Amino acid sequence: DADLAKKNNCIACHQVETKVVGPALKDIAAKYADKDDAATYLAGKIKGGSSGVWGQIPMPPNVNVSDADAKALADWILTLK
Numbered sequence: 100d101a102d103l104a105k106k107n108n109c110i111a112c113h114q115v116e117t118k119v120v121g122p123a124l125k126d127i128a129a130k131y132a133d134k135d136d137a138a139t140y141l142a143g144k145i146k147g148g149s150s151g152v153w154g155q156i157p158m159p160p161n162v163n164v165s166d167a168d169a170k171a172l173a174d175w176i177l178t179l180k
């Protein structure tokens with residue numbers, strides 16, 4: 100989980116409670132990934148990147164990782180809650 104996202108990049112700029120570049124994880128999730136399938140929806144926002152949805156620096160096009168590894172990360176978030 101942690102080492103996974105960190106292994107890739109999500110944790111690189113998305114911590115669990117604190118944030119460095121953009122918003123932290125517990126927040127992004129409780130921000131939109133706390134209702135319906137926002138995980139996949141937002142997953143669309145992830146690949147689409149963000150510019151003025153939060154206020155931090157604009158994140159590049161990074162979905163999660165690859166095919167399953169990425170899907171596993173997004174899930175790790177829904178579970179991160």
Ligand code: HEC
Binds near residue numbers: 150164
């Ligand atoms: C630093 C290079 C980052 C890495 C690595 C990842 N993200 Fe990121 N993310 C970053 C910033 C600076 C921001 C804020 C952009 C802004 O609008 O100011 C974000 C934002 C997100 C969001 C928010 C989507 C939204 O609500 O519109 C998501 C869902 C998100 N980031 C996901 C995400 C994932 C899954 C990452 C690992 C693949 C990941 N980010 C890495 C900066 C960085």
